[PDB]
Amino acid sequence: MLSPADKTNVKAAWGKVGAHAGEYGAEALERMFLSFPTTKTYFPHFDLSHGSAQVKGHGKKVADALTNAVAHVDDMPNALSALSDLHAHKLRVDAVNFKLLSHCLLVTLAAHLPAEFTPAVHASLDKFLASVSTVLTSKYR
């Protein structure tokens, strides 16, 4: 459960992401594929090569959804219902993988928002991605 400070922290940090969210989306995926090669098992149909337009495009998609979630920080379950559906009934990504993408996204923000990536902000973002993960995997069974 996200506290008011957390929600604040998150909106601030993401606020700064801005026009680069797509790019960060892409970079986190790239980091994931390289660090946790098992995650590649869900993208056999993609070109996983550096700067692949498939990865780029996907990065955008993920970023936008994250944006939408920050915007509806208060009503996540509802804002991401379709996405929870998609993952639970179509994609069926194993729940362990959500932690891997979450970690790669933190790393990405760290690397790009030095001034803004304080310990308190780091904590908030982590809890946020955890909440997002929970929602996305809540209809699995």
């Binding site: 980091r31 660090s35 970690h103 790393v107 690397a111 780091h122």
Partner: peptide, 22 residues
């Protein structure tokens, strides 16, 4: 630790460098 290194080295801490630290 990995988040701190990224935090510190920004640019320098590339995906391939993170993979090795992992």
């Amino acid at each position: 630790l990995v988040c701190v290194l990224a935090h510190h080295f920004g640019k320098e801490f590339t995906p391939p460098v993170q993979a090795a630290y992992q």
